[PDB]
Design a protein around this ligand. Sequence first.
Ligand SMILES: COc1ccccc1CN1C[C@H](c2cn(C)c3ccccc23)[C@@H](N(C)C)C1
Length: 358
Amino acid sequence: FKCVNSLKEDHNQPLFGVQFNWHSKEGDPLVFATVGSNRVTLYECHSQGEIRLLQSYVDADADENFYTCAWTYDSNTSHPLLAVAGSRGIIRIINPITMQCIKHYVGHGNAINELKFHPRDPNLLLSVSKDHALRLWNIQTDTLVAIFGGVEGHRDEVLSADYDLLGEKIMSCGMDHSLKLWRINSKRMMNAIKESYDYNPNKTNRPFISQKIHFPDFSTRDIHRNYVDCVRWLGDLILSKSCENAIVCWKPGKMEDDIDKIKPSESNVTILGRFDYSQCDIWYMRFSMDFWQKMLALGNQVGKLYVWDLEVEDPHKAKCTTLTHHKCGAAIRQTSFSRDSSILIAVCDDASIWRWDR
Ligand SMILES: COc1ccccc1CN1C[C@H](c2cn(C)c3ccccc23)[C@@H](N(C)C)C1
């Protein structure tokens, strides 16, 4: 990777998120979104490092702070869609072409810290909240499918979550120091998703009933000793981090325990490796992976990028490379690889955007 360009957004506030559109069409340029202040902005990547500014959506409320965004597509038309959310607790579905807000959703109106789309169903949107719950939405029928919470759920803000390969289960994490597993391939959840697709409020008298899921299928506080602010599945293993200068690779149970035989009372974890780094001991710093999960990237609080090659036989054999530029000194809150991993974008606390090309 070589640094080919940078720019700064005019609001001068932190950029909390960046995401390439991995649903961009053949023959079209690569596009990424950034979120920070009360806006979302799209850019196209062009030759000679050019980062071409397109158009923003700016919230009507000057005090909105978008924290997260995620791409999907319309299941009938194929056109890409961009979901954004943050401090107001409003999920907006944005038409990226025109930057129109197509529609919006509200749970209880508390801040949303992360959005993720299901890996196999473009309509299933997971939101994680300041109010300690996760919410699963069906954005085809505009229904709240399920709320994951209760006293055995998270006990402080939920900061991140991730679906596994096939979207059979979710791992969530947050300020309570815990990581929690929630299976969504149970008979109950499969039925709830089916019912969400069969719901049309114009053809019935009933409201749509959301599931209350009050018991995780696994929970641990044994991985980290502070806020857990990013989680991703790596097959049946988990990668997670806190503010302790480490990404830990671990699994529920003992070494030979199958993830799908793990019971809710399981008290053990197994540590398969740990990727250490420096100067990333502030809260709220995200790592990202490429589409194929060959690579992992994390920025630190003084503008250094760490990239790990995971194309090795075991997690602890990951190969690290580092990327620095003398003008890049602000905290990097999130990174995003293009789908082919030819481009890596980093976004920062000073509203700067950094492009690295392979
Ligand atoms: C990059 O954001 C990440 C990264 C990992 C997990 C979650 C988030 C989203 N955050 C949005 C919030 C935030 C507000 N202000 C003013 C900030 C200034 C700096 C950083 C973060 C914030 C945080 N809540 C809990 C207060 C969580």
